[PDB]
Design a protein around this ligand. Sequence first.
Ligand SMILES: [K+]
Ligand SMILES: [K+]
Ligand SMILES: [K+]
Ligand SMILES: [K+]
Ligand SMILES: [Mg+2]
Ligand SMILES: [Mg+2]
Ligand SMILES: [Mg+2]
Ligand SMILES: [Mg+2]
Ligand SMILES: [Mg+2]
Ligand SMILES: [Mg+2]
Ligand SMILES: [Mg+2]
Ligand SMILES: [Mg+2]
Ligand SMILES: [Mg+2]
Ligand SMILES: [Mg+2]
Ligand SMILES: [Mg+2]
Ligand SMILES: [Mg+2]
Ligand SMILES: [Mg+2]
Ligand SMILES: [Mg+2]
Ligand SMILES: [Mg+2]
Ligand SMILES: [Mg+2]
Ligand SMILES: [Mg+2]
Ligand SMILES: [Mg+2]
Ligand SMILES: [Mg+2]
Ligand SMILES: [Mg+2]
Ligand SMILES: [Mg+2]
Ligand SMILES: [Zn+2]
Lengths: 110, 154, 59, 219, 305, 115
Amino acid sequence: AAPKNRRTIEVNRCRRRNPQKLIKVKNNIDVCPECGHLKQKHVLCAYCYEKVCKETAEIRRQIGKQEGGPFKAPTIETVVLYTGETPSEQDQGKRIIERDRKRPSWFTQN
Amino acid sequence: ISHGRVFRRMGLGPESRIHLLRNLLTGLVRHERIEAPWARVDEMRGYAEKLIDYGKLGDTNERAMRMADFWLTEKDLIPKLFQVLAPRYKDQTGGYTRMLQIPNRSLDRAKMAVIEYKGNCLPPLPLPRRDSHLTLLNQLLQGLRQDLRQSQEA
Amino acid sequence: NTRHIAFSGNKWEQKVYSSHTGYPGGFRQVTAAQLHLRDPVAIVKLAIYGMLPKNLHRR
Amino acid sequence: RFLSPEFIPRRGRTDPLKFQIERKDMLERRKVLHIPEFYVGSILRVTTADPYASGKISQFLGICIQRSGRGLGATFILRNVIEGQGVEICFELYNPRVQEIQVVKLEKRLDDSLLYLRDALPEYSTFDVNMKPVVQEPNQKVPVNELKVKMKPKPWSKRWERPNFNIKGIRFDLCLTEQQMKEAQKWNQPWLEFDMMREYDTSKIEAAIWKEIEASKRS
Amino acid sequence: KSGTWWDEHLSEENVPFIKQLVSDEDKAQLASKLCPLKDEPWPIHPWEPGSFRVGLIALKLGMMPLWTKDGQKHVVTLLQVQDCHVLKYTSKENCNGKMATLSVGGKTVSRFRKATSILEFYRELGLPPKQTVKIFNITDNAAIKPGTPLYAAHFRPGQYVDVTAKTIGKGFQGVMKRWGFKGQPATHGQTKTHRRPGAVATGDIGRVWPGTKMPGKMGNIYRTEYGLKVWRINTKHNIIYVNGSVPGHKNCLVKVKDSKLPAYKDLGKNLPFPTYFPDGDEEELPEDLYDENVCQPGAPSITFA
Amino acid sequence: AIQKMTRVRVVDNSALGNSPYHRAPRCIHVYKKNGVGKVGDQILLAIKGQKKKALIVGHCMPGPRMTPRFDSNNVVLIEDNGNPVGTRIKTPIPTSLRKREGEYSKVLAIAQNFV
RNA sequence: CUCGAUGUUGGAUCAGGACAUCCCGAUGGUGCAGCCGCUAUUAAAGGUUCGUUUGUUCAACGAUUAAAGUCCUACGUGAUCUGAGUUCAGACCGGAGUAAUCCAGGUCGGUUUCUAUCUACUUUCAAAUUCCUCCCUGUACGAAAGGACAAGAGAAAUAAGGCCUACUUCACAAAGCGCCUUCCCCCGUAAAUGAUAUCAUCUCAACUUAGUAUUAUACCCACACCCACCCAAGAACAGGGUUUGU
Ligand SMILES: [K+]
Ligand SMILES: [K+]
Ligand SMILES: [K+]
Ligand SMILES: [K+]
Ligand SMILES: [Mg+2]
Ligand SMILES: [Mg+2]
Ligand SMILES: [Mg+2]
Ligand SMILES: [Mg+2]
Ligand SMILES: [Mg+2]
Ligand SMILES: [Mg+2]
Ligand SMILES: [Mg+2]
Ligand SMILES: [Mg+2]
Ligand SMILES: [Mg+2]
Ligand SMILES: [Mg+2]
Ligand SMILES: [Mg+2]
Ligand SMILES: [Mg+2]
Ligand SMILES: [Mg+2]
Ligand SMILES: [Mg+2]
Ligand SMILES: [Mg+2]
Ligand SMILES: [Mg+2]
Ligand SMILES: [Mg+2]
Ligand SMILES: [Mg+2]
Ligand SMILES: [Mg+2]
Ligand SMILES: [Mg+2]
Ligand SMILES: [Mg+2]
Ligand SMILES: [Zn+2]
């Protein structure tokens, strides 16, 4: 169905600038106590998440280098050890992933 | 009128939804931490928990072996599931997976969340933690609790 | 003393107030006596409303 | 240890207090009317009070083809061929009109539903109205009859060959062709048996129900 | 300006402590109101013709079959009274209506998820907040002091009641489901018209009459069923077995009041007035009342003769 | 249960029924305002090219509990006066017809089996 | 008024309105004994069926009902639908014409577009109509045949509003073929006393009664916890719960 008449700029403004169509102010933005960057209360910090993802990607690359082939999932647990670290009694019998860097402070060796 | 519809409609059909959940579950079993859209990463959390339950039931159980063979597209993960994943949670009676919302995806601006199996060797994710007990409100509540305990024990 | 008004002649039975609720079959006509019984301040109000100018100041 | 099927609530969003009270009423009725143990396939004779009847007492004997309903109002359907006319009657377990329920023969079939006996031959649905009650020795497993019936020529009341019904007591190899079997093997859903979330535990609920039944027996 | 919730700033130690405190306080407040006749009761006038008493707010647990002594089956609905108390009284002059009104509360809810005004209103009365508050028009002689609890014994078997509740909302629905329109045939050439309204009006008027049936929201309004018989009263769990179905889904709060039908009029002479007081009652009622014609589970099998 | 164009089976030993014919008995009127016939209702049948009245003594549609459900739409041919055409009903009929026996006494008398 | 386009016959869906009323309601007369009828006044709240052949509107027929009402609404309604008919291009039969072609002629086939800008509207929230059965009663009435009304009880159908205990489609739920509830009136006349007109007279005389509802009542009604999660709530929004925020 074709329009009967052209709609005026006044009506167009009334439709477009209605408070429903306006962007609302978000009040859930907070400050990450660790990295100091902005974050939402229900969402993880992007900075910390990216850091953890980079470290996990490096660890997975090392795991794949150790495995050296597809369809090769070890039957034992896995422990990641950094420079200047020796295998522990818990680490005994578990595949060791060696990282050529100092252990991060946030990556507490639990 | 969708009342009491626990399972939502995703994929090209019921079989497509099952296959997508199976692929996500296989990736989760392999890498122990995967990020995915919130609805898709939430739908298969119960499937992952029940898969761990079957692993606890054991490899000698024919039904458990059938379920693992179905839900694990890569056959190298079945020994993993029956040998390391289940004994890891042997003590726990449930809650083997953590799901946390992450910032939305860059391209489609989709609601994304990361799911992981507890006790993984990967670096820990940042977690939502409550305020310390040394804050003003917590100290006031602790004093109130001490006073109430004194009154009760009096 | 709007309840004690007096109508000349047989207006209590002849005069009809009509209205429409807007819905089909919602056309209601009542006599002056019925309207007075239902609302004792309606006849004078309607007369004043009719006599006032038909503009936005009437309200 | 047999728990009656109606003593298991259906999965939903109902307050367990209603189930508890309904079970209390069910047990208080069971103490008056001894409801026996039977399955889908067992032969039952039900004697009920009925107005406008010869002696006000009506007895019907037949095979149990369906049990459905939870709590008060659970029903079982008895089918029997009388004078060449098949008659199916739906009896409520806890209806006070019921005077007596007797298990003439206790057995089980290969299927949880015997609704295909409507389309099966009358010989598999014909039972003697006056048959002596068989003897089931105590502390014995319930026998599982493996009688694969022969069906009438198609069409049937329902497409029994499709996997959704999943019937294992019909001579499909005799009543159907290879092409028909292949066509029926098109609605099959292999993922349905592996959908883990579509499962009901019933273990804890059954244990609690057994505890409440034991308490009712004590009191 | 930041959004806040009760447990946002609480620590792991203080999270269960506040919950325990509020639960214990609610239990104590509920227990303290069990002696209305021992805590300054209002005068108890006898029943008189043309007198209306207060009603109840109940929870729809579900439905159950029942059998009568005439060999008939009736489906009943179980309505459970949960934490029902009188909250507010308004005089006839201040009601801005025709008769005095009394406020009745329903299911108990958390104090955290409520407004400040509601919390400070309930603090004066010393009761946990109620999920739903309803208003009952009662006569002056049926006045009840606020804070008095109410139980399912307020209604007795052999009484017809009215039940008001919000029905199961079905959302935006088409004409065929909403109003029962026949629709159009599914074959014989029909083109993209199977469930459409069709013609909405005539061409002469040039408009659509108000009240014309069109697709829209359906199923979520207040509906009242009139004349449901009370077959059975369970005084242990405070449950009323009401004849027939009632509006609303399971686990919903409904209003139960005396029937306004002219047939069931002035039948409250034998009913308790203004309400049932278990504390003042000396002869405790039996667990189940079972009316007269209801076949009790312990009764022998019925033999027609 | 039984409505217009429904092919029914005549169960009494009447001469008009139980006879060979190319067409089958068929209901053409149910004598009910709702248009649906149940047990104990009179219907009109076009049998052997003739119009006759019949009483419904059984239908395949499930009904109330504690009531029989037959595998065929069994009817008994009667007349306008209320008398049956046949003299024997070997097929069992529900006992619920004994409430209507005030107007079907002869039909229930010629009947032999009550299920 | 429109040929710089105002789309039609019949049908489907939706109905709005008038009474010149088919039934149900209330009255007068009868060539009104009762039952059936005929006629006149008032009443539009409620309802007024399913099939066979025909494109049919209509008519004919078979079976029911209380009834299967008459019309207006752009011959209501094709930016909701249909295309059997009418009314293009093909073809046949009868007739007219030398022929091309033509017929109130007949017959087969023959493309039905549109994403809604504006007006209007999108829960007129809740008092219901009718048939049948028993009794009245084989009574009143009537020579007989025949045969009520009022009152009471019960059981149904339709319509409106809800629900899933049982059956069924099926199974965390949605539905009917299933179950529950459904309450006021409607004004034509019939009659006392009584003047103008010392009788009498129901009264556009004063006045009493059948005789009436301020349609009664019911429902709705507290609101900066709301970041987040769940929901029997829902298109978004909104709403309910979180004392169920690892
Ligand atoms: K024109
Ligand atoms: K023009
Ligand atoms: K306009
Ligand atoms: K005169
Ligand atoms: Mg999609
Ligand atoms: Mg079928
Ligand atoms: Mg809903
Ligand atoms: Mg249709
Ligand atoms: Mg098209
Ligand atoms: Mg289509
Ligand atoms: Mg013929
Ligand atoms: Mg133009
Ligand atoms: Mg109309
Ligand atoms: Mg008229
Ligand atoms: Mg037209
Ligand atoms: Mg069109
Ligand atoms: Mg149009
Ligand atoms: Mg055509
Ligand atoms: Mg020619
Ligand atoms: Mg044609
Ligand atoms: Mg063609
Ligand atoms: Mg459109
Ligand atoms: Mg009568
Ligand atoms: Mg006189
Ligand atoms: Mg005089
Ligand atoms: Zn951070």
